[PDB]
């Protein structure tokens, strides 16, 4: 441990570089390691940016908010993260350099703390003083090297062990004469000289790659999973769409397709129903039918109540007098379906909340001649009456104990970025022109399964237009949604740019490029 | 260099282990390398199987055929291949162990030769004796270590340099009393102790990963790009389908989608035409129309003559009297299309070979009331008349100087494995039930762009059914097709297994599992 | 000839509250490895796993027995490879050591990235391999993740002249650093390295697919390549599975509530719903059939040709009234989801079924066109319940069946119900697997059983799988090979699943 | 204990002669024997065939069948069996030579095991590896 001081160019203040070990490192003997694998000597000499190792302190940020929270692991450094795929186990700490863009005419302090494994992080700078910690001042801070121990009770780690953390928060609030001033903080890492790997194994792991390579396909090349016959023509933003309740176009890094979503939305769009006894009260044209369940023959409450991939477009509460969904429908015979034409259809019975506006097995079709217990093709294709983008945007409700996709929202100050397609009318039943949005396309998150996301982190994506004269930035969450930072009805982004991986960020990260 | 002999268990012969340097290694001083990066000492001690380092000598194989041809590079060894992604450059040779499953009651010889860079490989064992080489005998061979030089005229390599090769062929034919006897040959590699890397760089490269990780999605989860509204329900084999001329479902590792193929086949299935003056001679119902080209407005001969992703189903030469394609068609108005219903359509004019049975802009629709210069929706949906699987299987001809996909064939003794879907009839125009095949699905080769193929090598895939009580093996070629080895009309493989990467093989490799 | 592909790291055992020495003589005698026996043939494919072993006390006969009284252990094994090779064979095995937390690959290419040795059939005999104890902890507790030894075909077995097979056995001794940690009562969860079987003959065992009729034959048939049965299904892991029971006789009798209406175009064929004492809420996740109730096949859409046969009679205060024979079947005679389906809906050929009345159902025969072949294929599984999986013997093997003759019931009355005589096969009897729960099977291992006839003069060898079936190695093909049911089973050894029984049944006499 | 190898006439294989003590012999002091009676020195030098010491392995024979089972006693050797009639008691082990008519173009293995008194013989070659063998 030490500190050195440098005078600033103009002599109007100083910068400090400090090296500290808040907690002693306990160098493992590695006596139980079958082999000890040395790293290339240059890997100890290269400080790379840490995944999620970037935060901005505004004068708004409270001394209660955690700015950075990072596990002490091979994932801290680019080359140890790549190298670890080749190894069964690892041992040893990291040098963690906190680079602070401070200034002598500001005021305020950071605290950085080492937190042992199986201990929770407190939302308080007062409580962080109970840990091994350092305090930095914004007037003089420039570089702080934390010698972060690998805190363990085992000779070396395998995967899936619980790890010590670095935590950074504001100790004392940022002050400046200017309202626009920010302290930018960046964390870099290299393995300590005592860092080792333990056993060569083939480089196939569940653990996420340190860099994600994205195909460079434009959004217009990707399927809209809520309207598969129509191409994506814009990325779209609308500040009133504060939540998503869709069951189609729902994917996650962890679980794959969730809700009633599928990776072949074009081959799943078609369904079949068996036509029931009876019709909706007051509307004898509105014959009931039950969607056929190949996946759910015995109608188990834990498996989906609707066929995999079948339409989740909305029509509002108790609104069949006003608007409907539209489909091609035709009766089943040898080899296919007969007399296929456009009919109005909807979910439920236009009255009861358990059925109406609910994603479940019972539908009505507005055709007066449904034969009882006969099968009918159902290909959803449009909407009719007073229907519009906002009615189609709100899906029918999920219900019961099946594994539906949850309702999701962007963090405060952010907005969802949608994959949007134009769905055309068709005329003599008559449809209306409407725009369909999806939260995500399966063709983007396909690539993300092939690389993985680091646990607890989000992809910051550049979206590149005209080769780079415009670049948008979005956060793609592992929970499936993609999101933008906005200031100030609908807003349109061209669909012929391409996604490029920028970096890993925390869910709490504020995107610097603003839409 | 040396040789040692071991007596066999029963004393009925001997095995030899030989170490040889056919050509001297020239250890680079690395004086121009900015840094020299050491490998983990255990990487020099691990012999892994080489990509494509596996061949079977039958008594059928000629002393003219090249059995193995391998570039001396970091791609020879699993851990040097993974490590090289992290580095700008490399230097040094490889130990190459040729493991021969020989026997004392066989006869015959191998030759192994080192070939300098910018020299061609001869198809002759007589000419291989002009190189630095070794000869092995099948009675006594067990292990041969070749100390293979890194032959260069530069201090160290960057990517894209031309490399020295190991070549193995039969020197003298295999003989045995048994007709079933084979010599199995396997090649393993480790870097020589003088092997080094030169400069740490972020691990992002065009160079293919040594192991491919495949999503585990079943074929039924994947789109059929020749019939997007219908799911894949079987993988399929038919020994009469000796070639593929399709323009849809054509993908390559190198170029992506080729011919008229797309990564969103469901969003590209729809087209529009402008209705021309006149009709096919003798059939006044068969009104001409031109497919609209958004991608080709000025009708450039080098850009495609048909809209991206539009139907390439066959109907035979001069056969409109016998069979047609079927579509939904409707006239364009405000917001969409009016009076949409089923019509017969086809390519060309049912007579001239430049138009009939040709994938080009001019079609006819069998509707007597097409308004001149009005636009019509076209959604292909089935086939009519004498149409069948074999008529749909042969696409319309490619023509002219646009960048079409070439006609491809399996190597002799192999057969294509097809993604197959059932396309149902529709009835009063009346369609017929037909099965549509695709050569490949975009959802499988999506994964292969995210890993790459080693240049000149093919993926051997296991296809895993019932968790492993049955496993098929297929070769997936970088040229887009997938293929099986067959002995002894159509054959059906279930679509609910999953693909698993087995290994890299040469195009010449004979799959050991036979369908 | 001693190979350590990965180094053995000697634990100090500092942390151990006691360190328990083994008898010095256990380190000096190599025993056979409990499951370490496997076969390679010219048919055995490249990249196939022949042997998988956890590196644990279970690798040796004496340390597997001793481990029953210890909480924990440390140290590796010295393995020796005994190869019954021949002068004409060529080929290679690969032996790989997998670290504790790592998944086993499915190809030779990925397996060569582990610490390994390549073993040629000309020189592999008496080769010694150290199996190291890989850990990051001072000693193991029970239930810890363990390193594996994996043996795979690297180059396939080929022969000059004649087509031999090679049987490979491992032998083992613990390395000198091997120790145990803490005395516990001799009841611990590791399988005994020897299973002792009580000498009960097959005829003394129940047939769980026909409880009233004794087993008369062990049976083999080359066309019975599949079992889909729900009855007679027992595993060492789970006990009785898929609607099977440990008292098949007591479970044989169902009741059904008669249901309104009748089969379409067949008004005599009245519906009923089987009553479900164990599933009264009618959950889709619980079985749709009473436990232990008949799973006899009666063809597909086959009611005009063949039916099942039972005694039935309506419930009363005094038990059941006017009990006599009827034809019955599962579901409808048409709908694919009901017909030939193991589910709650049945029909009975009795016009007299009163609505909401409850009827006894005692299955006891089959009628018309029903044969052995049709009884052998059970009604289909359907829905989300824990039904027994459809199983096959591995390539080149046949199931051994427990067989009983079911005699024909005849009536002389015009239109009276009439049965045809049939043989009923069960995949396993609960009376054989009885002792396997107490002993355990080693992880991923098969029991090689001797079956002993004529005082020892004829010995059939069968492989008893922990998934609940016996198989035999067989040559030729036959639709009626009989083995006497008056022998007894004797445990021979544990074997890998892909071991090929040497003792081949000449299936065409 | 030792092993020696001889090349076959034609050099098409080898024969092995092995001497082994699977279990240590415990030479009795004979302190309680009233007299100790020596055998003629030539009786230790004569290997006779054992009563029941002959079996044929066909490819039919299972690795579960016991081929030979013999008590270690004066009845093993012709002259010790005749001599023992003249004596009340005996002590000491036997050299047992197993002569195998093998060939280099066959395959397969024997196991030979010493089994202590009051222990049962298992019908399994897997279980015979638990004994000195």
Numbering used by the authors:
A (entry chain C), B (entry chain C): 2 to 429, 435 to 494, 497 to 523
C (entry chain B): 19 to 527
D (entry chain C): 2 to 134
Could you pull the original sentences from the published paper?
Caliciviruses are a diverse group of non-enveloped, positive-sense RNA viruses with a wide range of hosts and transmission routes. One area of calicivirus biology that has gained increasing attention over the past decade is the conformational flexibility exhibited by the protruding (P) domains of the major capsid protein VP1. This was observed in structure analyses of capsids encoded by many species and is often a consequence of environmental cues such as metal ions, changes to pH, or receptor/co-factor engagement. The ability of P-domains to undergo conformational shifts according to environmental conditions plays a crucial role in infection, significantly influencing both receptor binding and entry, and enabling evasion of the host immune response.
Although recently, organoid and in vivo models for HuNoV infection have been reported, these studies are still in their infancy and most of our current understanding of HuNoV has been inferred from other cultivatable members of the Caliciviridae, such as murine norovirus (MNV), FCV, and Tulane virus (TuV). These viruses have been widely used in structural, infectivity, environmental survivability, and disinfection studies due to their genetic and structural similarities to HuNoV. We provide new data to show that conformational flexibility in TuV capsids, for which we have yet to identify an environmental cue, varies between preparations, potentially frustrating efforts to study entry. In TuV and RHDV, this increased flexibility appeared to be caused by significantly reduced interactions between the shell and P1-domain in C/C dimers, compared to A/B dimers. While the purpose of this is unknown, it was suggested that this particularly flexible state could facilitate interactions with host cell co-factors. Nevertheless, the effects of different conformational dynamics between A/B and C/C dimers should be taken into account when considering calicivirus interactions with receptors and cofactors. While it can be assumed that the mechanism and purpose of P-domain movement is well-conserved among the Caliciviridae, it is still important to characterise P-domain conformational dynamics in other HuNoV surrogates, such as TuV and porcine sapovirus, as well as enteric strains of FCV.
